[model samples]
Each structure stands twice: as C-alpha cells, then as structure tokens.
Target: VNSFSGYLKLTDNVYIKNADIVEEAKKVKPTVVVNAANVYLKHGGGVAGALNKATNNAMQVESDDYIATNGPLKVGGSCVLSGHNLAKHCLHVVGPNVNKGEDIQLLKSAYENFNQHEVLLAPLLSAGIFGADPIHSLRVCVDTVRTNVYLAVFDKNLYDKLVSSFL
Candidate 1:
C-alpha cells in the first residue's frame, strides 16, 4: 500500500492529495496549517504530537500559554497561533467526537466558521480517533474550504479513492 507523496490539483489553487501533514506543511508553507486539535490544546498524540515535534516544541509552548490565557475551547471552535517553521500560522480546531447525532453538526461547524486564509493545509477532520467516518469528513472539509488548499490524507486507500472520485 503506497501513499501519495505529491498532489493532484483541484482547480488552479487547491491541491488535494495523500501526504504526511507535517511534510506538506513544511513543503507547501500555506498561510495556515490546520491542526486536528483538541479543546485543551495539549501537544498530545497523533498529528498534534507530530506537529509539536516539527516545530521543536515552540508550538506546544505557545498552545499551552493559549489555554492558560483563553481557557479550553468549545468543541467545534478554533484558534490561531503563530507558525514556527511551518506556515504563517497554525489554525487549531476541535471537531466533534462522534460519527452521528448532533456531533456531525459540530464537525461541520468547525469548517463553516473557519476564518479565511489565502493558502491552507488540512487533513480530514474528525476522521481519526475523533470517531467520525473519513468519507463524511472528506465531504465536509471539501465543501467548506474557500481558498487555496492542500487537502492532505495520510492513508493510501483514501488517496486512491479521492483520486478515483476525481476521474
């Protein structure tokens, strides 16, 4: 099972591909790199942990300080932090934790309310440990984004599926 390290363009601006989020964040240097973040903003496991390492823990430190000042985020809400060696900023968002119920709305809310950024890198929100199905997550992310985007996916199967859908 191979992954898509490069990208396929969606329009002249958006690039939708399967990629390691950290790698694409560094290579693309979008205006914002989207973090599949938690309400607490801890530099914990999964993509969050990897991104913290990529930034040499500066991002973690800044995120911790944000919690100290702003307190925990509401689920589906987001915050922006200065990017360190990645993009112009890191846009941290907390999507819903369930596959169904009102939780879907929360995940959509995460995308719908996102502030504009000229260039962006994002993964399928809520598709991992957060418990939303990846297919639905893909539709939500694709539907809401309005700017230049790198819609990154780490899984080879999903990449092929996305590519097939494009044809």
Candidate 2:
C-alpha cells in the first residue's frame, strides 16, 4: 500500500512529499498549512475537518470568529488563521468548484496565494468534494507553488499518479 512513497523535487526549492496530509499538518511547524474550505470558514468535513480535530476544534472556532469579524471571502480568495496545534498558521482557501465549470484562474489564484507563503503543506484542493480532477489539480500545484512545500496526499490513486509524474 505504501509502495510508491517518497519525495519529488518539483523545482530546486519546491518539494512534494507523499504522506497523509493531516499528519503532516500536525507534525510540521513554521510551514503554513493550507485547507480547502469554503468562504464561510466552515471547516465541517474532509481535510479541513480532520485538521480541525488535530487542533482540538480550536481551528474551527477561530475560523468561525474570522468569518464573523471579516465576513466571508470571495472565490479564489483566502485568509490565514492561527494554526493552533497544526502549523504556524493555516491558510483557508476558496477555490473554484467544478460544479460551476471550475474557473482555472480562481484555482490558480488560490494556489498562487499559496506561493506567497514561504513554506506550506497542503493536499489537493478541489479534487475532493469540490470536484476538480486529480490530474488537473496536480498540474496546477506543480505550476503554482514556488517555495518549499509538502504536497501531502491521502488517496492511493493520487499518490500513484503523483509518483508516476514526479518520482
């Protein structure tokens, strides 16, 4: 099951590590972790939910507070929040959902924001419930992240694809 596990050098600086994203999020500090959540800051399920659990739900509470204070973010937009037990911070991103034809620019925008951070750890955005294709998401990730990053993965199929392309 862990056959194709290793790290891929996307560039001289950027690296993609095949591992459980949640575990990486909790273990790594200094890096800003990214979570594919909605503009509402409701990290109710999926990767966001798992990360919230890692932080003992403080991440969710803080997210709710952020939404309450600053209001919701626009699609392709994001905001950084306290990382709690996860990382130095957690970037909550709202990418284009496939249900709306998937605006590639918006997805790129979110990943581009990810580029602004010096270090980051995140899984595939929109490739889950948001419905973007895994291959497409992987391509965007390759093109966007400019600094050091851990492209954590939970899906076996995605891990295999990531390995085949970069490993």
Candidate 3:
C-alpha cells in the first residue's frame, strides 16, 4: 500500500496526502480518458476512490487534463464525479449503471471524442461491485463497453478473457 504522503518526492511534484492524489491528477499535461460501463470501480475504494486517484494523477502530471461527460450534468445536475479534478480538461463520459443508458452515453462520447482512448489499465474488481467474482463481472462489463476498447486487467483470468472473450 502506498502511503498518500510517502511518495511526494517520487515524481517531479509533491503529494502530501491521499487526498492530494486529486491534486496530482490536475497537474498532468496530457489528456486523461476513461471509457467503460462503470466509470468507477469497487475494490480500489469504489468509483469515488478511482476518481480521486484519477483526478490526482491527472493533476500531478497535467493540471486540468481529465475530461468526461459531454452532455449536461444529470445526477442532481452534477456530473457523476466532481468536475474539478486535475484531469478536468480531458475527455470524459458518464456511463449507465443499471441499464445501458450510461453505457451508451460513454460509447457516443468515445465515438465523438476519440484519440483520447488508449490502453487503459484498471484493477479486476474495478468493473463493478467490489469483491465480485471477476469473470461474471468482467463479462457483463466488457459486454457493455464499446468494442475495440483496450483493457488491462489485474486478474490473470481476466487477461485470458481479453484474448478469448474481448478480442
């Protein structure tokens, strides 16, 4: 486990706390793209946790580089996650949770703002509810996400699925 405050010197910047991750993400100079069914995940502390990390990573490398959700804010007139993260300026798309609405939302966004999509890496359980059996969850998640999307999974089984199922 990485102590939030421990690696302030690891990069050219300094992150003093776990909360500072968001700050780091804001500093990133490159675009931060996220395309998938579930914009957030489970084990890695849930979607909120992912956003926190993503935002921080973006802030550290290129302040205000993240971008998601091209349309108007919904959930309470606000985006799924806070829009102020470091990667705030990059491409972002909010996906559906229960139905395909969010999935479609992400897909259309991808089709429109491509070039940002790249080899995305995420934890196994990050697809859906935490502690979920990786296979079923990933199957459901991969099925929902747009085709041709590159994903790197932490679970070894998931890697096989990439070759067999997602290819």
Candidate order by TM-score, decreasing, is 2, 1, 3
Q: Candidate 2: which stretches are off by over 4 Å?
A: 1-6, 100-102, 165-167
Q: In model 1, what are the clashing residue pairs, if there are any?
A: none
TM-score of each: 0.85, 0.87, 0.35
Per-residue accuracy of model 1 over 25-49 as CA lDDT, tens digit each: 8876777888888889886877788
lDDT of each: 0.78, 0.76, 0.33
State in Å the error of residue 46, model 2: 1.6
lDDT of 3 by residue, 1-167 (tens): 22122222212221111222234344432234242323322213444445545645432232222223242333111122323443324333333343332332333232323333332222222244333344444444454433223233433454555445432
Report the error of model 3 at residue 81, Å: 11
Query: lDDT of model 1 at residue 162?
Result: 66
Backbone clashes for every candidate come to 0, 0, 42
The window of 10 residues in a row where model 1 has the poorest summed lDDT is 1-10
Clashes of 1: 0
